[PDB]
Scaffold this active site. Structure first.
Site, short mmCIF file in Angstrom:
data_model
loop_
_atom_site.label_atom_id
_atom_site.label_comp_id
_atom_site.label_asym_id
_atom_site.label_seq_id
_atom_site.Cartn_x
_atom_site.Cartn_y
_atom_site.Cartn_z
N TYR A 101 53.13 37.82 52.50
CA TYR A 101 51.79 38.37 52.42
C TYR A 101 51.88 39.89 52.29
O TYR A 101 52.39 40.56 53.19
CB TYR A 101 50.97 37.98 53.66
CG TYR A 101 49.90 36.95 53.37
CD1 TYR A 101 48.75 37.30 52.69
CD2 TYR A 101 50.04 35.64 53.80
CE1 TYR A 101 47.77 36.37 52.42
CE2 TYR A 101 49.06 34.70 53.54
CZ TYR A 101 47.93 35.07 52.85
OH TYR A 101 46.94 34.15 52.58
N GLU A 105 49.03 42.01 51.21
CA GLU A 105 47.69 42.50 50.90
C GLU A 105 47.67 44.02 50.89
O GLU A 105 48.27 44.67 51.75
CB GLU A 105 46.69 41.96 51.92
CG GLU A 105 46.54 40.45 51.92
CD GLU A 105 45.67 39.95 53.05
OE1 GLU A 105 44.48 39.67 52.81
OE2 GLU A 105 46.19 39.84 54.18
N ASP A 137 39.82 42.61 25.92
CA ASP A 137 40.40 41.41 26.51
C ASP A 137 41.38 40.84 25.50
O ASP A 137 41.04 39.96 24.70
CB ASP A 137 39.31 40.41 26.89
CG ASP A 137 39.82 39.32 27.81
OD1 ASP A 137 41.06 39.13 27.90
OD2 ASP A 137 38.99 38.63 28.43
N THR A 145 45.73 38.08 29.99
CA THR A 145 46.58 37.15 30.70
C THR A 145 48.04 37.58 30.56
O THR A 145 48.40 38.34 29.66
CB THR A 145 46.41 35.73 30.15
OG1 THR A 145 46.61 35.74 28.73
CG2 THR A 145 45.02 35.21 30.44
N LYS A 199 50.29 32.94 27.58
CA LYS A 199 49.93 32.89 26.14
C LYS A 199 50.98 33.67 25.33
O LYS A 199 52.17 33.36 25.49
CB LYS A 199 48.51 33.40 25.91
CG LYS A 199 47.44 32.62 26.66
CD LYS A 199 46.02 33.08 26.36
CE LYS A 199 44.99 32.46 27.28
NZ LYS A 199 43.84 33.35 27.39
N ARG A 210 51.52 32.24 34.53
CA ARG A 210 50.07 32.39 34.53
C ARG A 210 49.65 33.43 35.55
O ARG A 210 49.83 33.25 36.76
CB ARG A 210 49.40 31.04 34.81
CG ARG A 210 49.70 30.00 33.76
CD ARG A 210 48.89 28.74 33.94
NE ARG A 210 49.06 27.84 32.80
CZ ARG A 210 48.33 27.90 31.69
NH1 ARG A 210 47.38 28.82 31.58
NH2 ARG A 210 48.55 27.06 30.70
#
Ligand code: ZVR
Ligand code: ZVR
Ligand code: PLP
Ligand code: PLP
Ligand code: PLP
Ligand code: PLP
Lengths: 452, 454, 452, 454
Positions: free
Chosen positions: B54, B56, B209, B235, B238, B244
């Site tokens: 973790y 954050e 985008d 992304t 692709k 991903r």
């Protein structure tokens, strides 16, 4: 170029960083209550060819074709999710596509509420999570406080418990459309029955965010919020010991029928998310299968014993615990009586490979916190038992005493942090404790791969 | 119990499913323009111990300790991101924590806009993405249309290109605060200069985008949106051929000295506003793929993607197929099947039954449940060493499936009758089995990135 | 057609209705706490050629020309408004264009808040007004609850007073941007100093909505909220005894400067309203001039005496008063101990020309109310004194006793209402009381015109 | 103190101001298209004891008692409203409680729309009203643009008419829930049939804001919006020649039997949602004026308004003035002063100094602080028995003021220099005093509705 070269040969710089982090986890005493060590079986699915499949939609209702296998994987994950929490498929459905715990909560709000509809969650310094609607006196912080109107409810500082009476009083005035029963830093069991009564009175949905305690719920070592909640969200990691992802459980059947299924699913996709992470979905399914085994009930029982042993050990050394003790996987230490704050203790413990996080006590006003949140799930996964956590508290006590001596020789917090690195005698005293901590931790087994 | 047992030993049911999906990917002709095959190096980082951390916050400003290694990994991912797209670190920053492409877009809107602020994007049937502000005529579909007010700009139905003139006219009336220059199904290059001029007139943010064309932009085989856009989202999979995840590029520095104010708002929207703990295993897998995107290997890959897309387009034109906007200039082709007697819905299920994965696409049409044509992509099979001649045989296999669908349409009524006969008619199922037999036999011969059995 | 024909000759049907309403006001005992009888001087300006002037904008900043006289009228109204409430023009400005009290409040919210910003006002059944953010458990009712997010604060039912402690507790959790100090049915003085402290703590604007008590404030017979409020709204009628319109007072000068003036004025026009009603503005100016006279202080003092005499008379007859008594112009009677509800008593009193309104008592849940709100301003304007209001209570007691006997002979409320008209002995008993009430009321003078 | 003393006895300062304003109205040439002179009969009801009655709620459903007479007055006002516009009470209802025209519009939006729902109205510089959704490029102006999302539709700058084609195109993209067919500065008739067709396609409510032309619609001298509109709002003053108030007409009855759901929502939005106690004195004054609107006298008045507007338009055309949209078909004229060398801001202050009240108006222009021409109205002076020849002399007085302004523009620089010289130059102030002398002498000879001295 084939794309089949190993990471060790293809990217040695990144492969080294993977080994550095693996070594840090193996040698450290991981006490962050939200941390766990994922099994190799789940990690094998997390890094699999399922990353290469765009399956927008749901099993049988896909935008694309060629999803026959990922439909089986997603349907199996749903079945294992319902089985892990002993849910009747006629009474409960589950969405396994939330990217994480926070997207899971945002999907529930988007599904059931209009923009600026009202939400009540436990205040962040009181133990609640960001996604329960946190905003300071100066700024809207969580998007849950931006797209929706949140008002927190508070602990009773005298007891350290959720003030269910003040929640009932204020919910009658605030009229929330949804109330969140779920915490990030709370050592006691939530009165879901009382939450349900408050929600029924004000006509609000009861959302149980069991992310921290989901593994304990699945193993049936603590009461299940599924007996009282309309919606249940959770992370798939933490006490569930899976890959990082989210789940949305929802009631189906006779409420007049329940109307959660279509709204929840539509909110996840196409409203909020894009293509599902099928590699994470499979790793979640692997973890949920493990959560149904007698092994996992033994693990979760040991998590409770270890947290109680850690709480008992801290009490014997003269530490104070918020709410007196613990009924779950974590302990809330109040360090203000011992003369140290959570920020100073967390930094000293970090330098001796003991990972904890400072935590606000019910006295402060969110003021460097004078508390510490300690968790048992991670080290319990490494086969820590009660005596091992008593040894952990011994190491913690040494770190606190080191911080106390540095506090007497420093002024501000930045002088404290700088003294731990610049001062020679403090440096070697921390180095000795760090070495003793790491030899102790390295001897325990570690779930996952060997090198990464 | 140690947690070190293999997946095949501890969960044979899931291991079998992993192998079946791997066998399906290996034996099929993947033509979905948004699909790709991730390298084994990135998958080894995706399924790593970085899932157990973790972190954050951001490097140097975490909420917990013990983030010393993930800080190096996140910072390296940022540096590799800026290098992959040839950005000056003094003028561009990047957030590598978005969980996917859709979270990356929502973070930009939350960072730069108040709720119900106005957004303009290409309409979804015209080639836009859901996260650009798609709402139908009866309900708001995407959360982009719920939390913000979106109005779509359309294509020119006569040319198949973006009507930049109508966009300029409607933007002066709608007064958007942000316009998205990005597509999900569009075979031509976007005039980002014209997009910036429209945004500069109405004083709106220009968000690019580039998720579909990110790999092509990194390899510099198509013009880069970073020369005109203030914010760029994408992304990491692709065309980038990564795990991903998502990325948010933002302008930094001087816009006295009036500075850019994107960095603090973008980062704050990602965390603590929208997301929780980062997926450090995905971040490392992204950094692995971003390093590969800087190599001369990737430049040759994206060049082959372009040639394969044009070879697939020409092979379709020379067999009696119409293409939206005439042809292609990127990685995909927008084939129009109605000057052929078939629709995208009927063709894609026939193609799916012969291990050829495509998706129906709305053409500049009459109905919507039976959309015009198909969307076919190059990057997936190009990663399997597909050359120009290989895609011309793919078009040969497609055309054969197109003709089987046209014959089944002659014997069937509506859509459900069409799909039912494909599995119920003996001569049709056997004819589909033969084409599937040769498609799978032709696809298995090519290599496949990633692991061997999963 | 010249447009100079009298209403008596031009529209006899409407002229007759004007005379019917005039007779009803002259013969009735008007006890609605929000009612008053406007002077003829103000009515002469209300129905004047100032209706024929479009003066969008503000004095000196007009969209049109030819506004030199209405600029003088609007500027004079502002000066008389500040003088009536003893305000330093360097510390206070005033907008005299709100069409009524409700547009005045909506203009303040639009000026100072964003849509869905938070507002706290006294709950409607607790004595607060609609425009303070009222919404039921089923529906958003006031537009203040639609364009903004409201949460009410409540009375303490044991004392009948505003629970300033619960307001402070809940305001800390709700974080309102504005809190409203002002009531429609409250017999006690508001602790504006305590409201100010709560607002200062949570960084909220304090709006004082003094519509019911504005005339009492101007005459300096009760404490002024201008010593503690940032913004003050009021109707221009009610205790101010003017034409129906609204006012927005706002602080100007050093707060760092105050930034209310431009935002308040812009909200009224061009944001919300169109052309001002200059005929109402002039009638307001006439009333504000009257409010500065020694006559008006004597009137407001008599209003207090009459309300206290009415409260004392009711107590001697065995009636219970919410909060024990009154410190202003109205009395809150609780009729549940006497065995009658407010809905039944209000209907019986209406049929004997005694106008009151049913009022929720702190016990009920908004349930036909068992209370009654009685007001002194209207009859005090007709030169009623203490003994006259004691005679009013005598008439009220007879009506209550009539309602008690009908209650024993009827079941539902509709049977009660129908019995008052169908039953012969009840009809004539009400007719006798109505006749005695009207002869008593007709003998007192009436402000305004003679015939209309 | 009785409250029965006269205004002249008890407040001589206010009485003097009332007389001065009455003298200003009598001596001036009122040409503001939104102005009119209320009858004495309505003013006697406007300043009546009905101010002393709180009647929150509606007839038969009040919150207090003692509303028996105001219930008759409100119901009579409703019946007189439905009759004045020749509406079947079975198909139309009306709310007579809106405080003014702007509250009437906000009540309709609150009744039929959720916050931030979409609204389309004619842009304010193009002739629309503030309450139709006017927001500039730097801030939201009207509360219509704050609580709801408004996009304006524009005029055709080549014809001066509403571009119904561009409205249809932009409405399909904006997807409004309500479109306002109503104007504040527009000399032609609105194609409500085309408006209804656009609203029926995008499935939006058609609101007609006939406040400027309400008197003309009641007298049936122009086509009525009630044949196409679902909701109709209006002021009660202006052409209706009543006290300042508002009205909301809504369709009733059958739209199985699918009923209209406007009545309960409209009434609830007015009270308890938006307003408090009704202004019963205004409601009665409106009922007085609505009764007058049903008489053959009012039909002759509105006919004279039309002829006076066209006589003023022709008198302007024959003196070298251009008119927006060529001419007029209602009560006002949109004169374009830039084919003359003067602007609307300069002309209106010159005209104001000679007791001729007009307002500047944006023409289909370059700047905004110096708008094109002026807006001139007929209804005000027509109520003073003005005939066609009388308005032709008004144009004579206007043209003389136009020429004085053109000469002052030759001796002055910017706007402040222009207005300053009008009051500072001896020959200019004396020339203005002479024109003002003959304008006031010509206007005083005509009668004036209302009282004699106030
Ligand atoms: N009980 C409980 N314990 C824990 C332990 C970990 N977490 C999860 C994250 C906690 C969290 C998140 C955001 C803020 C936050 O807002 N920070 C800055 C923004 C930075 C900036 O300004 O640059 C601000 O205050 O603005 C915060 F102060 C604390 C929780 C939890 O959620 N609950
Ligand atoms: N203390 C105090 N006393 C008084 C005395 C008079 N007033 C002023 C109006 C009071 C008021 C307004 C609206 C509703 C209301 O909402 N009614 C219906 C809607 C009708 C429908 O549904 O057709 C509903 O409940 O929906 C209400 F119940 C009460 C006040 C005040 O404001 N406060
Ligand atoms: C792929 C894509 C998205 C969504 O990506 P996910 O990873 O599915 O969230 C959004 N916008 C564009 C333009 C895309 O190409
Ligand atoms: C962990 C947690 C979250 C957020 O999970 P992420 O995977 O970090 O998004 C939300 N709520 C609760 C109660 C949690 O414990
Ligand atoms: C006059 C007018 C308004 C506003 O009327 P007010 O009485 O000033 O509120 C609104 N819309 C239109 C079309 C108007 O003509
Ligand atoms: C009377 C009153 C109002 C509303 O006044 P209206 O003229 O009816 O709009 C609002 N608030 C309070 C406190 C009031 O007393």
């Amino acid at each position: 170029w084939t794309g089949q070269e190993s990471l060790s040969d293809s990217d040695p710089e990144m492969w080294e960083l993977l080994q550095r982090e693996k070594d840090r986890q193996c040698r450290g005493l991981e006490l962050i209550a939200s941390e766990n060590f994922c099994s190799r079986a789940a990690l094998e699915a997390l890094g699999s060819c399922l990353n290469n499949k765009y399956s927008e939609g749901y099993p049988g209702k896909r935008y694309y074709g060629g999803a026959e296998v990922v439909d089986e994987i997603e349907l199996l994950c749903q079945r294992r999710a319902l089985e892990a929490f002993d849910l009747d498929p006629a009474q409960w459905g589950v969405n396994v596509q939330p990217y994480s715990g926070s997207p899971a909560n945002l999907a529930v709000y988007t599904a059931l509420l209009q923009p600026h509809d009202r939400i009540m969650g436990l205040d962040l310094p009181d133990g609640g999570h960001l996604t329960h609607g946190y905003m300071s006196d100066v700024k809207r912080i969580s998007a849950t406080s931006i797209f929706f109107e949140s008002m927190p409810y508070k602990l009773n500082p005298k007891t350290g418990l959720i003030d269910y009476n003040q929640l009932a009083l204020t919910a009658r005035l605030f009229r929330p459309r949804l109330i969140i029963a779920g915490t990030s830093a709370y050592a006691r069991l939530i009165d879901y029955a009382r939450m349900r009564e408050v929600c029924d009175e004000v006509k609000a949905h009861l959302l149980a965010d069991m992310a921290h305690i989901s593994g304990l719920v699945a193993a049936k070592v603590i009461p299940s919020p599924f007996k009282h909640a309309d919606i249940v969200t959770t992370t798939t990691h933490k006490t569930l010991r899976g890959a990082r992802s989210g789940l949305i459980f929802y009631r189906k059947g006779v409420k007049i029928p329940y109307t959660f299924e279509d709204r929840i699913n539509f909110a996840v996709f196409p409203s909020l998310q894009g293509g599902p992470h099928n590699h994470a979905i499979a790793a979640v399914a692997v973890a949920l299968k493990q959560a149904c085994t007698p092994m996992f009930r033994e693990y979760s029982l040991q998590v409770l014993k270890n947290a109680r042993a850690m709480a008992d050990a801290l009490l014997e050394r003269g530490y104070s615990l918020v709410s007196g003790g613990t009924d779950n996987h974590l302990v809330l230490v109040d360090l203000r009586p011992k003369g140290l704050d959570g920020a100073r203790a967390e930094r000293v413990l970090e330098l001796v490979s003991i990972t904890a996080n400072k935590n606000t006590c019910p006295g402060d006003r969110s003021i460097t916190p004078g508390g510490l949140r300690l968790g048992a799930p991670a080290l319990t996964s490494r086969q820590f038992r009660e005596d091992d956590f008593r040894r952990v508290v011994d190491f913690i006590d040494e770190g606190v005493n080191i911080g106390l001596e540095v506090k007497s020789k420093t002024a501000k917090l930045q002088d404290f942090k700088s003294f731990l690195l610049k001062d020679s005698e403090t440096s070697q005293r921390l180095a000795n404790l760090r070495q003793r901590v790491e030899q102790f931790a390295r001897a325990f087994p570690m779930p996952g791969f060997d090198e990464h």
